[PDB]
Amino acid sequence: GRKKGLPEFEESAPDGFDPENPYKDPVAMVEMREHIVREKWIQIEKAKILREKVKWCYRVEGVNHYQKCRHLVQQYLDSTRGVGWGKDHRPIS
Amino acid sequence: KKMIATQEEMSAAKIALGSRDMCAHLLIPLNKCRQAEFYLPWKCEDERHVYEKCEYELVMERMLAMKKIREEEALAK
Amino acid sequence: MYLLIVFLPLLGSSVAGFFGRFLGSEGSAIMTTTCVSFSSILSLIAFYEVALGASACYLRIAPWISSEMFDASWGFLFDSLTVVMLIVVTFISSLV
Amino acid sequence: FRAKVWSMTGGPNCRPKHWRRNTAIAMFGVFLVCIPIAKLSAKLEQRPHMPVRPIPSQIWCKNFGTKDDYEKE
Amino acid sequence: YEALAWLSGGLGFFVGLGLLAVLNDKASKVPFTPRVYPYDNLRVELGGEP
Amino acid sequence: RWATPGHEERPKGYFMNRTPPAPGQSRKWEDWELPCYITSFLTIVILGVGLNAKPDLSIETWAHQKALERLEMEK
Amino acid sequence: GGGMETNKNKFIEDWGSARENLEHNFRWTRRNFALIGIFGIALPIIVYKGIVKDFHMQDEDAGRPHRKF
Amino acid sequence: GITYKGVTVHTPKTWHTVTGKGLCAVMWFWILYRAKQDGPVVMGWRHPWDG
Amino acid sequence: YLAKDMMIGLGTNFWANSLLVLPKNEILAESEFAAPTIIKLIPILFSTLGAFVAYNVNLVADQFQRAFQTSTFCNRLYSFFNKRWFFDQVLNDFLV
Amino acid sequence: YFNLSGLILCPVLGSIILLFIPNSRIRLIRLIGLCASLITFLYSLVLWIQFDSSTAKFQFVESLRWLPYENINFYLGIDGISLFFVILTTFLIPICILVGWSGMRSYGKEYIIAFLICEFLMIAVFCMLDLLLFYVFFESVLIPMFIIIGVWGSRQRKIKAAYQFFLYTLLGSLFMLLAILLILFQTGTTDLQILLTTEFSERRQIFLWIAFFASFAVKVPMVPVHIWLPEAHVEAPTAGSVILAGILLKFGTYGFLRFSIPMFPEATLCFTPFIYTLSAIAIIYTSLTTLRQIDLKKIIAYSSVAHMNLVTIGMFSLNIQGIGGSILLMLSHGLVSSALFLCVGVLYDRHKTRLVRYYGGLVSTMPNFSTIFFFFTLANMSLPGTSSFIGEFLILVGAFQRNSLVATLAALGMILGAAYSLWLYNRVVSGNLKPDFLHKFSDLNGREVFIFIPFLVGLVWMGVYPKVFLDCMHTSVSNLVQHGKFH
Numbered sequence A: 001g002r003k004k005g006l007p008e009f010e011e012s013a014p015d016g017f018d019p020e021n022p023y024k025d026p027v028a029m030v031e032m033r034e035h036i037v038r039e040k041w042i043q044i045e046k047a048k049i050l051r052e053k054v055k056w057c058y059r060v061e062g063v064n065h066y067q068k069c070r071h072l073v074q075q076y077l078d079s080t081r082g083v084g085w086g087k088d089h090r091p092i093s
Numbered sequence B: 001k002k003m004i005a006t007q008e009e010m011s012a013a014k015i016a017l018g019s020r021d022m023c024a025h026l027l028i029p030l031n032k033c034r035q036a037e038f039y040l041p042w043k044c045e046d047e048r049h050v051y052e053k054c055e056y057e058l059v060m061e062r063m064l065a066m067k068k069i070r071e072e073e074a075l076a077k
Numbered sequence C: 001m002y003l004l005i006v007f008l009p010l011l012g013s014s015v016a017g018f019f020g021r022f023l024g025s026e027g028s029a030i031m032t033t034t035c036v037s038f039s040s041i042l043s044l045i046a047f048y049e050v051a052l053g054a055s056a057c058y059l060r061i062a063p064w065i066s067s068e069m070f071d072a073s074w075g076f077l078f079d080s081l082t083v084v085m086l087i088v089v090t091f092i093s094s095l096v
Numbered sequence D: 001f002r003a004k005v006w007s008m009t010g011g012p013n014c015r016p017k018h019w020r021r022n023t024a025i026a027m028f029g030v031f032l033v034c035i036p037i038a039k040l041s042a043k044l045e046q047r048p049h050m051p052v053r054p055i056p057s058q059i060w061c062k063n064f065g066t067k068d069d070y071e072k073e
Numbered sequence E: 001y002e003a004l005a006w007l008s009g010g011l012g013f014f015v016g017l018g019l020l021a022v023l024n025d026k027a028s029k030v031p032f033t034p035r036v037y038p039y040d041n042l043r044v045e046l047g048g049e050p
Numbered sequence F: 001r002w003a004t005p006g007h008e009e010r011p012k013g014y015f016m017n018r019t020p021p022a023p024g025q026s027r028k029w030e031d032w033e034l035p036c037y038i039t040s041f042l043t044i045v046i047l048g049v050g051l052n053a054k055p056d057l058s059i060e061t062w063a064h065q066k067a068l069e070r071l072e073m074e075k
Numbered sequence G: 001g002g003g004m005e006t007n008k009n010k011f012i013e014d015w016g017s018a019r020e021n022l023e024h025n026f027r028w029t030r031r032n033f034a035l036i037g038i039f040g041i042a043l044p045i046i047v048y049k050g051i052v053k054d055f056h057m058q059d060e061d062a063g064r065p066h067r068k069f
Numbered sequence H: 001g002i003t004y005k006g007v008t009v010h011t012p013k014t015w016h017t018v019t020g021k022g023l024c025a026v027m028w029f030w031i032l033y034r035a036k037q038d039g040p041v042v043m044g045w046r047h048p049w050d051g
Numbered sequence I: 001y002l003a004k005d006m007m008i009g010l011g012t013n014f015w016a017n018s019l020l021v022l023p024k025n026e027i028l029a030e031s032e033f034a035a036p037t038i039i040k041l042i043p044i045l046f047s048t049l050g051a052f053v054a055y056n057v058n059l060v061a062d063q064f065q066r067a068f069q070t071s072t073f074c075n076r077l078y079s080f081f082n083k084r085w086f087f088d089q090v091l092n093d094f095l096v
Numbered sequence J: 001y002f003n004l005s006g007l008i009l010c011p012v013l014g015s016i017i018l019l020f021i022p023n024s025r026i027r028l029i030r031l032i033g034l035c036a037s038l039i040t041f042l043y044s045l046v047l048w049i050q051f052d053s054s055t056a057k058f059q060f061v062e063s064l065r066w067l068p069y070e071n072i073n074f075y076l077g078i079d080g081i082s083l084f085f086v087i088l089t090t091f092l093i094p095i096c097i098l099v100g101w102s103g104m105r106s107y108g109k110e111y112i113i114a115f116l117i118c119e120f121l122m123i124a125v126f127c128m129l130d131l132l133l134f135y136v137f138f139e140s141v142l143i144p145m146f147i148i149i150g151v152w153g154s155r156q157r158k159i160k161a162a163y164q165f166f167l168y169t170l171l172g173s174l175f176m177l178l179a180i181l182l183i184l185f186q187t188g189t190t191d192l193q194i195l196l197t198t199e200f201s202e203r204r205q206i207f208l209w210i211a212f213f214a215s216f217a218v219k220v221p222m223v224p225v226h227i228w229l230p231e232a233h234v235e236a237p238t239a240g241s242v243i244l245a246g247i248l249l250k251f252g253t254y255g256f257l258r259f260s261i262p263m264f265p266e267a268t269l270c271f272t273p274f275i276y277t278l279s280a281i282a283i284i285y286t287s288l289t290t291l292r293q294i295d296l297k298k299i300i301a302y303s304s305v306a307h308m309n310l311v312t313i314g315m316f317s318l319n320i321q322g323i324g325g326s327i328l329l330m331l332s333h334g335l336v337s338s339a340l341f342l343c344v345g346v347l348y349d350r351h352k353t354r355l356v357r358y359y360g361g362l363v364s365t366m367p368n369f370s371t372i373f374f375f376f377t378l379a380n381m382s383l384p385g386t387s388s389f390i391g392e393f394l395i396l397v398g399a400f401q402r403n404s405l406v407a408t409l410a411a412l413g414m415i416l417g418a419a420y421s422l423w424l425y426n427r428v429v430s431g432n433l434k435p436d437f438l439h440k441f442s443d444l445n446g447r448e449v450f451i452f453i454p455f456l457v458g459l460v461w462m463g464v465y466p467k468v469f470l471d472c473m474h475t476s477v478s479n480l481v482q483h484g485k486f487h
């Protein structure tokens, strides 16, 4: 019982959750928890797409890849600072 | 002797790093003729000996530069 | 074509091992060696079209480990360094 | 006692009478299933580089010289 | 247990001959000068900033 | 020895050690075989045309389309 | 020669069903105390200290104060 | 090969001697061929390629 | 002879990105144009010396140069290299 | 509308029909039992079709009242994790029926009663969101396994084997029950959705985490308590012993995922080094103990212990990939260990020795069994291309990203895994043939040949393309890792 298209749950924000008292509205806390992962997966996926950007850049330019991909290398290295749950430097979400 | 092939002509050419020394302007014709000629050692020599002597000159000037230090170190001792 | 370089020895090995009773001690000998020699000829063709015709070949079959930002794929890197060892492995394997 | 055990990969000296007939089928079997591997690969082998000289793989391939830019991946 | 005594000598020759290559100091015996490239030792084509 | 016929009337050994019966009659399938075989076929068909019928809805493709339409907003 | 089972040699039966029950032997002896105190209380403590030290050094590099644990 | 008191050696086949001789002679000639044309390269005298 | 020039030829353009060598640690031209000529052709000298000593020991001068029935330190020299530095002994007993 | 209720009812109907069938009708008992098991397997498979791997909340739920005030009640459901365990539980049991098919005349109908009872019992464990009833069905599996080990044990020493397996479980079970009582008295209910959204006290967190760890460290073999598994596992029938390492071993390890990690976010972090220092030394000590072993069954059980201690490292290392790799390794182990115990039990059902000394040179005969055994040993050998390697590579990745020291000790496990399993393979089916002991012996017939076919196909499928398994549960693992914290 679904439309054939991709689902869309919600994007803006969960209004019920208040950071000052995280355990105050249990109904809205799960919404915040799922929204966190649904927004972090966006960053993970854009990191993946910029990774393929870099990979095809190295696969096209040739020997001059130390001067024609630095604008994307700096866009990759900073994207690994707070991506997913992979290193002890957790992102400040 | 000073180099002349710089910026676009040096970067567009697929010459690898490390062989991009002072006198490497004539490597483009060498690799253009060598690549089409099946890389035969016995078919491409017109454009090779010039590069060999360019590297010869670079090595001998490089050791000439150290000659001065070698003959001046006697002052310290 | 580039997939034939890799998958033909596997296919020959699998069919020889599964049907080593259907083929005699010489049928497998003339079949697997023929498949490996075909792979060697393919490797020589790739060497001619890559080492001299300098244009490396790239591909990706399917994602192996499609976890988060840990993209593992069945792709291969038919590069100038790789094809020399393609020649080295295929020629010697067929001769052996 | 070797005849009793199956030896799926063939016995020690397994020499079927019509081994040539089976080998012809086996070689034909490889060729017929090798075509899907070759045909399915034609939609693959992306090589953006253009060789200085023409290779013989242009007839069955078109994934060369097309994937030039890397701003719309 | 006597083999370990020969083991120490066998590896001792390797490290002992390794130290002897420090006692001659071939680094300063170069007959030429360090290699230099144009454009700040090819700074643009090795990284840095354009 | 590449031209002589083989000295084997039949591949040695019996498949699953089951002696073939007299010629003319079938194999006399066993009680467990039929339900297990039909269940294997049902498993194959369900996992074949069911897995490649489920819409690709996940946290990967949804995030892929979302980040494809969100990375393009750099301005 | 119609027995599919093994012959169950006498000298092998004791070897088999003797190591299965070593509680009687391993009750009180001098070497047991040294072995237990050097490989059941010593090594786990050392590796636990190594792990907590690694966590502390990871914390220091990031700068965050180490957790008590 | 003729038979003796224990060594009844068999002579090598026709193609296992002449082929070996006519293939080894190629290498023997090739050693000097590379010692004449590219020989002057590594001797310390008369460095080739415009030298 | 065919591969001496085409792939080690002071900057051959077929490797492309396959093999990358940093500018700093690139010593190839002065490995050929700065050769003292007293060291380049020396391994041939060790080769011919080894030929001479092997021929002498194993064809003519083998009356004492082959079998050494001394008192001590010579049988153990034979065992030290035959048992390859007792690696199969010390490693086995002390680890496995 | 293929809901979860029917998946549990079908084995109940199968058992009920079998109860009133005369013992003489041995033809019908096996047929109807196998048919019920296969219908249950298909009903579990069809759930994977309609899984809808998109939502963070739980899938099909069934609520049945259990107390007068609806305080706590039977609340079914799967999220992303117990689905695969339900599928594998429904798949292993028909293999259990098939392996014990020839000798059913002596076993009687009581053999299938216990297996089907345990079948829907373990089905009701994985999809049980209510915390207390999860414990009711978590320890309900004591009786079927007790009966299987005791009534149809191989040797007479089975009496002492079952006592350990029982009492060790009861001790931790009641230790957990006390924590459940503390949680219910404090919070008020035991429903999982609510109980995950309650602010706990840090001092209370540690005690309750320890109380859960009292039993969950027994189901997964830990250093202090792992004696029960070999002694009570070598001495069980092959059809029954294949699920002690199949589903009875995945309760506590999976129980950590559902009732420990999201339940106590601030306590697992404080107790992380303790789990590391337990499991890292477990993978070493148990592996070394494995080498100096003679029985054919015990070596596989010890390898299983090492695999579980390895997966425990990757589970408590909270990573989006660590937990997914833990689930993949657990599924792969459930396949491979099951296959290995069938492989070593088919030898016992013909010769009845269970000693590697007697076995030798089994490649010159029964080559098909040798090939199958070699494939499953390679799967246990942790080679890439099989489903296991996908299993522990993610474990190593998750452990190294957090702690560098633990990853090296964990990978020492897969280094040492080549010392006992390969030695067993070369010492059982590749030695010198001896006619003194193994006078005569046959090869695998059509039953055990078909038994390994689903195992082989699933092994290869999840080894070369584990995408679908990871695809179906990326949302749930993401929700589990991100809990309590908001950064």
Ligand SMILES: CCCCCCCCCCCCCCCCCC(=O)O[C@@H](COC(=O)CCCCCCCCCCCCCCC)COP(=O)(O)OCC[N+](C)(C)C
Binding pocket: C010, C013, C014, C017, C018, D002, D005, D007, D008, D009, D010, D011, D012, J363, J364, J365, J366, J367, J368, J370, J371, J374, J375, J378, J383, J384, J385, J386, J460, J464
């Ligand atoms: C890294 C894991 C990759 C996947 C694992 C498969 C890779 C191959 C593993 C199996 C290789 C063969 C080992 C079989 C056991 C060897 C000992 C043995 O039992 O031999 C048997 C089995 O013989 C075989 O080797 C059969 C080989 C079958 C394996 C063929 C498949 C290999 C390719 C599959 C790889 C996967 C392809 C990718 C899938 C997507 C019979 O040999 P006989 O010559 O008859 O001698 C026995 C003596 N007597 C005659 C008296 C009985």
Ligand SMILES: CCCCCCCCCCCCCCCCCCCC(=O)O[C@H](COC(=O)CCCCCCCCCCCCCC)COP(=O)(O)OCCN
Binding pocket: F043, F044, F047, F048, F049, F051, F052, F056, J087, J088, J091, J331, J453, J454, J457, J458, J460, J461, J464, J465, J466, J467, J468, J471
């Ligand atoms: C000896 C005779 C044995 C007969 C078996 C077949 C003979 C060949 C055996 C060789 C091994 C082949 C094993 C299958 C390898 C498949 C590898 C790719 C599978 C894959 O990832 O793609 C999936 C294909 O779905 C599918 O259709 C997969 C169907 C596979 C059915 C296998 C049934 C095994 C059941 C075992 C159950 C064990 C349970 C253990 C938990 C869907 O991929 P996707 O999501 O990308 O969809 C795409 C939507 N765009």
